Amino acid sequence: SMSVKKPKRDDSKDLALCSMILTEMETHEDAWPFLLPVNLKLVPGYKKVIKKPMDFSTIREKLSSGQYPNLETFALDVRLVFDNCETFNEDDSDIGRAGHNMRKYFEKKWTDTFK
């Protein structure tokens, strides 16, 4: 509360470390469904159904331009990429499997880097 603070966690490396995680996600072989925004002119249903589209290139631009106020808002956009994927794609599809694999990969890197 006022004049009552928990000990200050060192957050000075968060930017760099979120960048590294995102590089590793970008270079995974199963990243291909997630590298670029879904083309809303060419994919029927996407625009209406997915209220908040997100992809790796859009996270990379937000990160590089100081649009993430803290590491939680960064994790929320990465998870949004996978939650979108699950909303639109069957589990038993190449893209559906890609999303589950990438989510697992992300979550482990997140815990190992920060928890």
The single-letter code of the amino acid at 19 is S
Tokens of 50: 């997915």
Distance CA 5, CA 17 (A): 25
Q: Does domain 1-115 have CATH number 3.40.50.1980?
A: no
Distance CA 64, CA 53 (A): 19
Widest CA span of the chain, in angstroms? 54
Radius of gyration of the chain (CA): 16
Q: Residues 6 or more apart from 18 whose CB is under 8 A from it? A: 63, 68, 71, 74
Final resolution, Å: 1.8
32 DSSP 8-state letter: T
Q: Residues 6 or more apart from 23 whose CB is under 8 A from it? A: none
Q: Residues 6 or more apart from 48 whose CB is under 8 A from it? A: none
Method: X-ray
